[PDB]
Design a protein around this ligand. Structure first.
Ligand code: XNF
Ligand code: ZN
Length: 258
């Protein structure tokens, strides 16, 4: 009886095995655009992905992760609200069963079809496992997806999903450029929060981009053909793998833009 996104093991249950679920800095949150304050002192965000080295794509039973070589400063995130250098380790998505749901963060209570999380860790802590134990250990860049025109840079991802249908399957995924997943603007909101799945550690500086990317209906349909189950088990489609918005508590969301 492990955690997931079903009636019996979903977000409302997680607090029993992970009491930090009811903590002071949980994610995601609703972004109230009229309460978020422009902070003129936020530095300009630096996304340096030209030397990124993708390795593999994995169905972990919750989402699929595109994993990178993070054993050197290749693909890094700096600037914005960040102090120091954060290395890209993986990206994944959260998505819905229908186009009106699937994001984790919300904007004035609007839910997007999906949300992309590019996960980075602070190199001052030496490895990712040490970093998740620190309040400033991780930086996750969140990008909303809406359904409309195709995103060309997503197609290579879409096309390998058939090979990783079930939990525990992986495939070689070299030479993928995550720059192709960004929107034109790097305008963002930032706040201190958490992992959005167990173990729900309060270790993340969230950076959520204002501008969504557009994907096609056909692209998100292929996400929804993935399985939460393992091979040879009854089929449970991998849909609605998102945590709803959590209380903001004693936090301020800052805007990089006027
Ligand atoms: C394995 O999943 P993951 O992607 O990490 C590669 C996930 N990571 C993950 C990444 C991103 C996101 S999201 N959706 O972008 O927020 C969610 C989960 C995550 C899972 C588990 C942990 C650790 N869990 C953990 C629990 C408590 C503590 S403690 N003593 O309280 O400090 C320490 C470690 P670990 O497996 O060691 C890394 O140790 C049991 C760590 C990470
Ligand atoms: Zn995530």
């Amino acid at each position: 009886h492990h955690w997931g996104y079903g009636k019996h093991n979903g977000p409302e249950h997680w607090h029993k095995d992970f009491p930090i679920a009811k903590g002071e800095r949980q994610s995601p949150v609703d972004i109230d655009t009229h309460t978020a304050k422009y902070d003129p002192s936020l530095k300009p965000l630096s996304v340096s992905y030209d030397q990124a080295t993708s390795l593999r794509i994995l169905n972990n039973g919750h989402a699929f992760n595109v994993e990178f070589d993070d054993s050197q400063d290749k693909a890094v995130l700096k600037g914005g609200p960040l102090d120091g250098t954060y290395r890209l380790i993986q990206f994944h998505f959260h998505w819905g069963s229908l186009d009106g749901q699937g994001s984790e963060h919300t904007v004035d209570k609007k839910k997007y079809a999906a949300e992309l999380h590019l996960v980075h860790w602070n190199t001052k802590y030496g490895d990712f496992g040490k970093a998740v134990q620190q309040p400033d250990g991780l930086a996750v860049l969140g990008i909303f997806l809406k359904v409309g025109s195709a995103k060309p840079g997503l197609q290579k991802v879409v096309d390998v999903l058939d090979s990783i249908k079930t939990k525990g399957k992986s495939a070689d995924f070299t030479n993928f450029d995550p720059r192709g997943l960004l929107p034109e603007s790097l305008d963002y909101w930032t706040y201190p929060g958490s992992l959005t799945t167990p173990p729900l550690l309060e270790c993340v500086t969230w950076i959520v981009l204002k501008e969504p990317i557009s994907v096609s209906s056909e692209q998100v349909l292929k996400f929804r053909k993935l399985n939460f189950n393992g091979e040879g088990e009854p089929e449970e489609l991998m849909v609605d793998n998102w945590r709803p918005a959590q209380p903001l508590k004693n936090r301020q969301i800052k805007a990089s833009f006027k």
